[PDB]
């Protein structure tokens, strides 16, 4: 998940949701 040009928090993991991407 890298293709956006933003970076969630360090040790979060790429998790999809009902809405849409997000960060877990």
Same mark, same amino acid.
């Given at each position: 998940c890298g293709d956006?040009? @933003?970076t969630c928090?360090? #040790?979060q993991? &790429? &998790?999809r949701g009902l809405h849409? @991407? #997000?960060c877990c």
């Open positions: 956006a040009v @933003y928090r360090p #040790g993991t &790429c &998790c849409g @991407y #997000g």
